[PDB]
Ligand SMILES: Nc1nc2c(ncn2[C@@H]2O[C@H](COP(=O)(O)OP(=O)(O)OP(O)(O)=S)[C@@H](O)[C@H]2O)c(=O)[nH]1
C-alpha cells in the first residue's frame with residue numbers, strides 16, 4: 001500500500017499525471033471512456049477560441065480580415081452544439097477561419113495578458129481531425145483536456161507488485177482549504193510546478209505571479225514538519241511549453257535577478273534552484289526533482305519509473 005498525494009497550484013499538471021497512470025498501468029482509456037471526453041475536447045476548443053476573441057476586445061485588436069466579424073457572429077450562434085458534444089462542419093469552418101486570422105493570431109501570441117488554456121493551440125491546430133464525423137478522442141486528446149479539479153479524486157493502480165492509491169486535489173485558491181483532508185498516511189508527495197507559469201498571473205488574482213504562488217505553496221509543504229518523513233518529489237512540469245516560451249519571454253519577469261541566457265538549460269536549472277532553496281533543512285530533507293512533460297506518456301513513464309524506485313527504496 002503506497003499513498004501518493006499530488007499537490008501544486010492550479011493548472012500545474014496534477015490531474016494529467018493521474019490520467020497517465022491509467023494509460024501506463026491500466027491499458028489506457030477505452031473507446032467508451034474516450035467518447036466521454038469528446039464534449040470536454042469540444043468545450044475546451046470553443047472556450048479557447050472564445051477566450052481569444054474576448055481578449056481582442058479588451059486589447060483592441062482588429063481581425064486581420066474584416067470578413068471574420070461575420071464568422072465571429074456565427075461562432076456564438078453555433079457554439080451551443082459543441083458544449084453538447086456535437087461539432088458540425090459549419091462550426092468547424094468558422095473556428096478554423098477565425099484561428100487562421102492574423103488578428104486572432106496576434107492576440108493568441110499575447111496570451112500571457114489574459115487567461116488561455118495551454119491546450120488551445122493543440123486542439124485548434126487539429127480541427128480537421130477533431131471535427132470529423134464519429135471523432136473519438138485519442139489518448140493524447142484526453143491527456144490534453146482541461147477541467148478544474150474540485151474536491152478530491154482517488155485513483156488506484158498496481159505497479160511493481162505494489163498497490164498505489166493516488167490522490168488528486170484542486171490547486172486553485174478556492175480549493176486549497178481541502179488539501180488537509182488528504183494529509184494522513186502519505187508515502188510521497190508529488191508536487192507539480194508549471195515551469196511555463198513564470199510570466200503568467202493567477203486566474204484568481206491578476207496581481208499575483210503564478211510562479212511566486214507556486215513557490216509559496218512549495219515552501220509551505222516542503223517545510224511542514226508533518227511531512228518530515230514523507231518523500232517530497234518535485235515535478236517541474238510543462239517543460240515543453242517552457243522550452244518554447246523561454247526563447248521569447250524574459251525570465252526576469254519572474255526573477256528580476258536572473259542573469260543567465262534565454263535558453264532551456266540555464267533557465268530550467270535556475271528555477272530548480274529557486275524551489276530547492278526553499279527547503280529550510282537541506283542536510284536532513286531531500287527533494288527529488290524531475291523535469292516533466294505531463295502530457296508526454298513516454299516521459300512520464302520513465303520519470304515515474306525512477307520516482308517509484310526511490311519510493312520503494314526509501315519507504316519500503
Ligand atoms: N503542453 C503541456 N500541457 C500540459 C502539461 N501538463 C499539463 N498540461 C495541460 O495543462 C492543463 C492543466 O493541467 P491539469 O492536469 O488539469 O492541471 P491541475 O494541476 O490538475 O489543475 P487544477 O485541477 O489544480 S485547476 C491540461 O489541459 C493539461 O492537458 C505539459 O507538461 N505540457
Ligand SMILES: [Mg+2]
Pocket residue numbers: 014015016147148149168169170171
Ligand atoms: Mg486537477
